[PDB]
Amino acid sequence: FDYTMVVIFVIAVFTVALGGYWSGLVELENLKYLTFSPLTVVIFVVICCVMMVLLYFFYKWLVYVMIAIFCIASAMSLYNCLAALIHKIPEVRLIFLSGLCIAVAVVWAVFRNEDRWAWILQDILGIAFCLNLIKTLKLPNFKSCVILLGLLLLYDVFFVFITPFITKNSIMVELAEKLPVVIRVPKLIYFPVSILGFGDIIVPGLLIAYCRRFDVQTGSSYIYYVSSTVAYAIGMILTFVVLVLMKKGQPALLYLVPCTLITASVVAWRRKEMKKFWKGNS
């Protein structure tokens, strides 16, 4: 047990409970986006696998390409999130916000080496990126949710567990000039860092976004969203316990997808609404 492990859990739940909640907020005003498809989901999974293999085998230039793309995407996402937050309280303001965001992104790009104090910048950029990507990506129905979660679960478990049995080098032991995707937090006793991927925040984030959208659509207030967030937090705690008591790295998707899927299925089945929750309205 350590204080750092608490901080990662708070970040991984605050920015998923807010990413999911915010998704339903725009849904409310619509009733007054790149929707996925099962074939599209499979294509995205295959492209993710190919991208990961290319990252591992062509690392030298792929790291710089990923840093540049992540910097631009995170600057844009931070601008969008800050503009959305400021819009509520009563353009030159947009230009100033874009300038501040690009200044933060440039500072992060030029200060990626010092791990003493670049982790704050990387955490803020990652939280903004995850929030924006959860808001903008909408799933059509629970079938896509289940297919994507299961395919990612099998893919990630394979990549982390079966790869050591063949490759002489786990692939993720090299993937975490480090990769600009993983969230880095040093030991918060005096400042050896922890790592949490963006997938743990995004994929259950997409499921919670869909749950909140369904909440808004059907009429129920907070049932599915609260249930999914509670199960996601319990999954994070269980993953942390298993990681500490196993002394090895652990694929969290393994202790996240079953919990979230089971809780969503149970909460949908208790009300006899599985068919509607699975087909997708309209």
Ligand X SMILES: CC(C)C[C@H](NC(=O)[C@H](Cc1ccccc1)C[C@@H](O)[C@H](Cc1ccccc1)NC(=O)OC(C)(C)C)C(=O)N[C@@H](Cc1ccccc1)C(N)=O
Q: Which residues are catalytic?
A: 156, 200
Nearer to ligand X, 98 or 170 (CB): 170
CB of 80 to ligand X, least distance (A): 21
Rounded to a whole number of angstroms, the minimum distance from the CB of residue 96 to ligand X is 33
22/131 Cα distance (integer angstroms): 8
Q: How far is the CB of 157 from ligand X (least distance, A)?
A: 9
- Strand boundaries in the chain, DSSP class E: 183-186, 193-196
Residue whose Cβ sits closest to ligand X = 199
Q: What are the backbone angles phi and psi of residue 122, rounded to the nearest 5°?
A: -65, -35
250, 239 contact by CB (below 8 A)? yes
Assign 186 to helix, strand or coil. strand
Rounded CA gap, 123 and 182, in Å?
Answer: 9
Contact yes or no for 131/81 (Cβ under 8 A): yes
Least CB distance to ligand X at residue 211 (A):
18
Single-letter residue type at 32: K
Measured from the CB atom, the residue of 36 and 79 that comes closer to ligand X is: 36
- Interface residues with ligand X (CB under 6 A) are 48, 152, 156, 160, 172, 175-176, 179, 181-182, 194-200, 203, 239, 243, 249-253
What does the alpha-carbon distance between residue 243 and residue 228 come to, in Å, rounded to a whole number? 22
Give the residue with the Cβ less far from ligand X, 131 or 179: 179
Instruction: Choose between 94 and 173: whose C-beta lies nearer to ligand X.
Output: 173
